[PDB]
Amino acid sequence: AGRIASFLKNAWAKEPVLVASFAIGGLAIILPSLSPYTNYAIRINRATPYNYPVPLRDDGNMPDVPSHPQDPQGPSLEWLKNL
Amino acid sequence: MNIMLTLLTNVTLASLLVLIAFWLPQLNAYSEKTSPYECGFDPMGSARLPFSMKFFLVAITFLLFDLEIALLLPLPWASQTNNLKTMLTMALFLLILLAASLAYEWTQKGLEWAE
Amino acid sequence: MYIAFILSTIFVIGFVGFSSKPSPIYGGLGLIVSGGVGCGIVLNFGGSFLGLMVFLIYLGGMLVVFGYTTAMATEMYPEVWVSNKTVFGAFVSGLMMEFCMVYYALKEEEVEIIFKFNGLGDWVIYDTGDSGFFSEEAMGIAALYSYGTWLVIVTGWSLLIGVVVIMEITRGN
Amino acid sequence: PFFDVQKRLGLDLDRWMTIQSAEQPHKIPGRCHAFEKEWIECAHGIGGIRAEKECKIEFDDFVECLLRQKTMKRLSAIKRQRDKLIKEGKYTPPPHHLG
Amino acid sequence: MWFEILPGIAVMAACLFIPGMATAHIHKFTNGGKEKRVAHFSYQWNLMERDRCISGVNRYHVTKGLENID
Amino acid sequence: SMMKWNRERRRLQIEDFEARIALMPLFQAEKDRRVLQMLRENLEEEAIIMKDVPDWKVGESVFHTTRWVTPMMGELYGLRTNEEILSATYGFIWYT
Amino acid sequence: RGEYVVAKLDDLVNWARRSSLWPMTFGLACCAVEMMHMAAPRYDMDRFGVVFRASPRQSDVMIVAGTLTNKMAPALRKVYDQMPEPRYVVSMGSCANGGGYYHYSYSVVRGCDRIVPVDIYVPGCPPTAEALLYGILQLQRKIKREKRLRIWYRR
Amino acid sequence: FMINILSLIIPILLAVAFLTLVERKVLGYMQLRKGPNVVGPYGLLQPIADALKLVTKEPLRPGTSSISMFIIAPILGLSLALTMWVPLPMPYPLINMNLGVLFMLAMSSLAVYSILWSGWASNSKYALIGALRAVAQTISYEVTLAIILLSVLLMNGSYTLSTLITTQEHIWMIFTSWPLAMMWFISTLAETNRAPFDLTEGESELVSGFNVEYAAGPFAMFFMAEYANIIMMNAFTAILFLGASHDPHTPELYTINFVLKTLALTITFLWIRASYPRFRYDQLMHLLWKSFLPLTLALCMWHISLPIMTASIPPQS
Amino acid sequence: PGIVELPTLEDLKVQEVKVSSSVLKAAAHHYGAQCDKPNKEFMLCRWEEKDPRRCLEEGKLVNQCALDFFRQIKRHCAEPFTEYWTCIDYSGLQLFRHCRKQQAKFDECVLDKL
Amino acid sequence: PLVYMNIIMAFAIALAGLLMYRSHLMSSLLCLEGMMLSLFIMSTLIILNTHFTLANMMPIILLVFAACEAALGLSLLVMVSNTYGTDYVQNLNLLQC
Ligand SMILES: CCCCCCCCCCCCCCCCCC(=O)OC[C@H](COP(=O)([O-])OCC[N+](C)(C)C)OC(=O)CCCCCCCCCCCCCCCCC
Ligand code: SF4
């Protein structure tokens, strides 16, 4: 309590830049755990298509994948459209 | 080859400037003008004696640090991968590793001019 | 084609620049220029990131070696490629060394020395593939933090050990 | 490895690079993905010494795809004899091969 | 009288002018009005060859629209 | 301000990427025809050039396998003109 | 006419010479501090188009200001000879003009001209900042009145 | 095509020449002096007067100098400064360049080599010391400049200079990385060898640093080289942080805005030149390695996780 | 060491769709929606066969189907295409962003006309 | 191809240069440093040719340790230059026995 408060007083008094650089460096490490948009950042990179998704031969029983890029079924990204 | 053309033109244009600044503006040398400068007097005689550094310690750390930054130049492309989780930890890990090396050198003297 | 082979030829006698022991930074002149043209060799094959990297950290690395030469490794009369007779002999022996084979390669294209390789230039060895919207070199380098992982750790940890090693050996009690 | 610590705990340390047809950043193919694939799964679990004579054809073709030296030599024979007779005459270039 | 400073800037500012629009004007001139097409990736560069080939005059910066097809 | 703009810049990029992959089938259908046409064009030329050589199979299988391979571009532009060589082989990299 | 052409190139050469000549940052005695007095914003050395450069390989006109001594003599001649041509010398004050107040002194050479060629002798002890600033002007006029390439044409 | 090259090279030399006038004139007005005004109207003819007189001055070749080494360095200094003007994203860049900053950074390091070689090539104390102070100066700024460079454009998306205009767009980039611009601006001051960090020249300490045996034309190429260097890297910091709007139909609208941005910023470079004493290159590497390096890591860590923080990863294309 | 086979010069010739890249990408979004069945068929052949010489028929289908696509737009509103594709041309990056007004005029033909 | 020949003979003269000391260690140390430049260029040539995306890794990572080898190298030369003064390998023989 007293020791840390005086120590912070001493560091802020002698070399403010170092006690600063330790601060921005300090929380930039623990924000990722607290970040709620990191999952969106994961979804950002997955959504971006570089290789064109070659179609699959349909021998039946794949209701999820559509037969045309107009049917509702299939992975979608309206979260990005809202964002 | 567009970069070659401007590179060739640039070094060419520089060479004309030194070319006509060496032949056109007269020539007259009589030794003491040609002699080295020592603030008016005659040098002790050298300019080749070991001019030993007093900051040799920090020079090598520059090589380690200038080398390691080349390890994090790919960062802008490293951000746009499907695995930013381990990207965040690994890229962070490098910056703490440089920070620790700087902190290590800092505490054990180091950066201050060796006497 | 010229440039691809011509630049590599400059890389050769540039390497003769420092392998012949001139004054140490005249050797520094020797490999800084081949480092410059070495960027060109990888550049023609794509390789822009790697080509700029050597033109980034070699100059950074070669920046201090000059200082050590002029501070703690220079003589009263600095060497040059013409002053000493052995280094001039070392220089010339590095000139007919590749001159015969490039003439041999240009005339026969089937030079056998050590390795067997044909001499139809090097424009052939390129590819017909399409990179799409991603550069192969710049993304393989960027895979450092996605798939390197352990390969990252050994490099970073050694750099720490580097700053320890370069400190204790020069500390002198 | 002398001590295959990789296989013991099952976690990879350096095997991701190793061979050419491993997974690539968003599936960028290699030059010889097909040839290297054929050779690798030819000699799998068969033994290093019991791989040269049997899974050979999948290998020299793969090392051909890597270097393409015999084909470049094939192009050398084409180009050499081309300059041999066109300088002498005979062959006149078709109008698509020179513009 | 710092307004005597401005004549130094006035020519200098005009001196910095020339490489600006010229690099745009020569690009406009050499590409026929439309600006200089850039190709940072294979797709863009593979395009310019196709535009150069389709035009039939061996220029990438001349484009044939819907009238080209029949 | 940067977050909103960066998200928007992304939104255009997938829009641009969507157009690119929409044009892929036509472009791939053109490149393979262009490549295969030219490989045959070399073969038709190769019929008349290979008469003096003692042993030469015209268009023999380059590899021991029969599966098709991507064509080593030396076969493609080997006997073309110099300008066509530099326009594509060294074209991209030398282009600015 | 050839003489017309050479005169035009002559006019180009001296105008650049007299406009852009660079005095040496050389100072010895009482004259030196008054020399930098006129360089102060009151008289504005620079507004006449000149700037102070240090080494001999740098400047145009040597500005000798102060008492010349036997010990100072070897370096002054060395530093003057070290200035590339064209080079001019002006002699500040009575002391540097010749002898000065210490003309009879054992440790003073009677005249900077005894050591280095001189273009203009600016008098006063110390010369007022006005007087030598004219001395620069007189050298501009003297630089104007030359026929270097003109005498070469008729040579 | 070459007409574009001359229109890129020739105006810079005149712009560099007129920098010498304002260097000697705004300083004077900032110094109670009137500046050069005797040569033509208000002195605008003085930069010309300097040019011919320097060219017509006698070139000097010191006896103890290495002749080839003495000549190659001035060529390298001027050529790099001039070729440094090709890749900027000035509305239509001469060469689009994927690694725009790396091209910017690589030869900026090679620029000091001309500064480096001239010191010993002149073969004396006052240039060898100035050359070695160039070593320590680029020991300091180079170890950190790449860190600032990476941090600012990490939100841009890639290393291409052209994408800077797109990235900034609505608001000035300095509004997002103002402590980085604090880092970047005065570190460029430390590479251009200006008043607070001109130890390579060192007017008072060692006569002229890496210039003592240089005379006439070699200086003319050297004087233009470092004047070209400051303007170009100031134009670099102009687009890096203060990039203006660009309308494709009216590219000239960008030029007028960009020119003033790199011009008012240039006036700053002349502004610090008058008001601040000289850093001793002891504290120069001391400061940039004691406070500058530990700080620039922190925002570098800040500027990498933060695109991941708010799902604001910029696109590469 | 064997035989190479190549289709003759006749069956590899189609009525090539000859229109510039900018026009193609200007209508790419609409082209990829409906003119997709030959496209999807074409590179199921490309990825399954892994041999271009075995997919010429699909290449013909996609080339001719795109021609019918370009025939339809040319016939109904050719003029609104003109300003949309020329402003795409003016963009060096062929950016869609500086095209919204022109894109709007194009969009309402094919939605209501076709 | 011929580009490969040029840069492997770059190794050979670098190999000859390294293990041939004439006057001082600094020149040989630089030759050791430049020896990896061919090693860099060598390894870089196959990797872009073969389009193996991952193994673009090692040209940079070879550069980590090759220059790190030089980093301890010229820092070792510091210890010589204090006890020995010069950097001559001919003098570098105090362990004659
Ligand atoms: C939102 C939460 C996260 C926030 C993350 C970001 C950090 C926020 C908090 C800190 C903000 C500021 C950080 C950087 C501070 C500045 C750098 C620094 O270390 O300063 C202290 C340092 C150190 O100060 P010092 O050298 O006096 O030392 C102080 C004593 N010790 C060492 C013990 C600390 O300052 C300098 O290094 C001085 C630099 C001088 C440069 C030349 C003279 C100035 C020239 C004129 C410049 C005018 C402005 C130009 C602007 C141009 C813009 C384009
Ligand atoms: S002339 Fe007068 S003012 Fe000048 S140095 Fe001599 S005593 Fe001093």
Short mmCIF file of C-alpha atoms and ligand atoms in Angstrom, two decimals, chain G residues 29-31 65-67 92-96 101-102 124-127, ligand 2:
data_model
loop_
_atom_site.label_atom_id
_atom_site.label_comp_id
_atom_site.label_asym_id
_atom_site.label_seq_id
_atom_site.Cartn_x
_atom_site.Cartn_y
_atom_site.Cartn_z
CA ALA G 29 42.02 40.65 -31.76
CA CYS G 30 39.93 43.80 -31.18
CA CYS G 31 38.92 43.92 -34.85
CA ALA G 65 41.18 40.87 -38.19
CA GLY G 66 43.64 41.43 -35.36
CA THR G 67 47.30 41.72 -34.50
CA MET G 92 41.02 44.73 -40.71
CA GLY G 93 42.27 47.53 -38.52
CA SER G 94 45.53 49.41 -38.16
CA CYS G 95 47.24 46.42 -36.54
CA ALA G 96 46.66 43.98 -39.39
CA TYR G 101 49.80 50.10 -32.29
CA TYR G 102 52.38 47.34 -31.76
CA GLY G 124 40.36 52.37 -38.42
CA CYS G 125 41.41 51.00 -35.04
CA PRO G 126 38.98 49.44 -34.57
CA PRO G 127 37.31 50.11 -37.92
S1 SF4 K 2 43.80 47.56 -35.03
FE1 SF4 K 2 43.03 48.24 -32.99
S2 SF4 K 2 41.06 47.12 -32.74
FE2 SF4 K 2 42.17 46.08 -34.44
S3 SF4 K 2 43.30 44.40 -33.41
FE3 SF4 K 2 44.74 46.17 -33.49
S4 SF4 K 2 44.43 47.23 -31.50
FE4 SF4 K 2 42.65 45.83 -31.76
#
